[PDB]
Amino acid sequence: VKNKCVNFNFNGLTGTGVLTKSNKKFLPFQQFGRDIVDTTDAVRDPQT
Amino acid sequence: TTTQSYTNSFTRGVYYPDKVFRSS
Ligand SMILES: *[C@@H]1O[C@H](CO)[C@@H](O)[C@H](O)[C@H]1NC(C)=O
């Protein structure tokens, strides 16, 4: 469920937040996303 | 047979260290 505060457990990556659609350019091997501060930003759905 | 000539690498041989998407 998108656009709602939920606790996600994506492939063992625990956390909390709001998730929705995006327009990244994830390369085939890419799995995660971060920033210059090294914090998990975007996750690829394992079953989607 | 084969040779063993030496050349320069220049800028070459850089890979993605991890599988973490990054931008800007
Ligand atoms: C996940 O498995 C189901 C059941 O076989 C399948 O219908 C679906 O396409 C699969 N999805 C991915 C991303 O592999």
- CA dihedral (A16, A29, B18, B9) in degrees, to 10, reads -160
Q: What H or E segment, with its residue span, contains residue A14?
A: strand A13-17
Instruction: Please give the Cα distance from A3 to A17 (Å, whole number).
Output: 9
- Residues A33/B18, Cβ–Cβ less than 8 Å: no
CA-based R_g, chain B, Å:
16
Query: Are residues B22 and A32, on separate chains, in Cβ contact within 8 Å?
Result: no
This structure's resolution (angstroms)? 3.8
Instruction: Please give the Cα distance from B6 to B8 (Å, whole number).
Output: 7
Q: Is B16 on the interface with A (CB under 8 A)?
A: yes
Instruction: Please give the Cα distance from A40 to A17 (Å, whole number).
Output: 11
Q: Return the DSSP state at B24.
A: -
- Residues A24/A32, Cβ–Cβ less than 8 Å: no
End-to-end CA distance of chain A: 13
Experimental method: cryo-EM
